[PDB]
Amino acid sequence: TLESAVTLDKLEVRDQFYPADFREELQTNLNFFLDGKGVDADTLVPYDTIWVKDNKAEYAYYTNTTEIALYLNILVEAEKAGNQKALTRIQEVLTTLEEAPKFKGLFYWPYDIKGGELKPGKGEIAPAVDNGNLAFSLAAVAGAYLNSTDPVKQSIISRIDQMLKAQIPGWLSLYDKDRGLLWGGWQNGELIEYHVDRKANESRLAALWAPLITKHLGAEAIPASVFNDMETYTVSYRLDGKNYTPILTWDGAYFQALLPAIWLNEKELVPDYSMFEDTTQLQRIYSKRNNMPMVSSSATVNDEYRPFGIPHLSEAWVRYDDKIAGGSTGTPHATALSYMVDPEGAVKSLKSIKALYPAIETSYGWYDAVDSKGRMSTKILSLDQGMFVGAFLAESINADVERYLRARGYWDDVKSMYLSFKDD
């Protein structure tokens, strides 16, 4: 029970993930997750938000399980680079998670971290989105050690299977038999009003996962339908004599289209990924023009926080004439996300950005928001840093997920469900 407390004061992945073009800059952003920078010493989870003025940091004492998933997968990659401290940390982190209060097995959003333990936020909110995300994270973590005869790694495996098994009540809880979709979650003891009803958003992993972990329960098996029946909408544009048909995220925000791609090889599993390629190029053009990064939910330049999307890449605007987010600001993590679609142009772009704005670099990472005029946030966010770094690791995290799904009999289910991912 009494153990030494390791300090991760160095964090490095394998060499293959660092572009020749861009090594240092990835390390800088990766360094966010060093102990004492972006990671809390007492709970050993990343802070939700930092403020950095001159390599001195202020901290918002919150976290969520999406930030923790990404942290985990990164740790795995540091472990593969040969960091033995990371393997200890992965076990400390699983303990935390096992200790975190839950609701029918599902994690809360957010977790308050003020005490030195995870308290559920005042809402008592239990979202499908965060539990979907973390389900795949743990798959990838298990995916990475399933071949190990090391008994410590075997241990991690069994602990992850347990923790996912425990979520069965939660997932069953969330299955509306009438609408045939997942409710969005639980909030203060009550089902949340809305449903997981669009493939083109973050919450799709939950819908993907529920059928899998409940596959065996026979009569009460949650149907694939919870994923398949979800709607997918594009819009058909033309530009300088070329057609684009971009997949529309609800609020136009990049992250909803490409976050899941950190865990799943969506570029192969989707029949025609062209829509994603198109959403990407349109984002890439709007970015280049406004001399700022691509656009997703992020910090503001004055340290608020706001969804940000391109109106013409937004379902709500295009489809329902309801504009719910601006394209005033860009964020580095959205440009880095795009390395999962086009890695050459992503590095060019981020490099282009740092040439224009040399002050964007801090020792905790690049700042989260950059205006078209060149104004900038003081905030750096664990969510965005995890997405930034994870984009570059996705090939390795994707392979591990697939290994997991193959071992658990899930892989054909996933592929089948992906057959449905096509423009309605």
Residue numbers in the entry: 20 to 443
Question: What did the study's authors say about this model?
Answer:
In this study, we used PgSGL1, PgSGL2 from Photobacterium gaetbulicola and EeSGL1 from Endozoicomonas elysicola as Group 1 proteins; SkSGL from Sanguibacter keddieii, a Gram‐positive bacterium, as a Group 2 protein; PgSGL3 and PgSGL4 from P. gaetbulicola as Groups 3 and 4 proteins, respectively. Groups 1 and 3 contained proteins from many marine bacteria, for example, isolated from marine sediment and mudflat environments. Group 1 was a smaller group than Groups 2 and 3, and Group 4 was the smallest in the SGL clan based on the number of collected homologs (see Section 4 for detail). EeSGL1 (Group 1) produced Sop3–7 endolytically, as did PgSGL1 and PgSGL2 (data not shown). All the enzymes were found to be endolytic enzymes, as is CpSGL. The five enzymes (Groups 1–3) were clearly identified as SGLs.
β‐1,2‐Glucans are natural glucose polymers produced by bacteria and play important physiological roles, including as symbiotic or pathogenic factors and in osmoregulation. Glycoside hydrolase (GH) families related to β‐1,2‐glucan metabolism (GH144, GH162, and GH189) have recently been created by identification of two β‐1,2‐glucanases and a β‐1,2‐glucanotransferase, respectively. Overall, phylogenetic, biochemical, and structural analyses revealed that Groups 1–3 are new GH families, GH192, GH193, and GH194, respectively, and that the three families belong to clan GH‐S (clan GH, classification based on structural similarity) as GH144 and GH162.
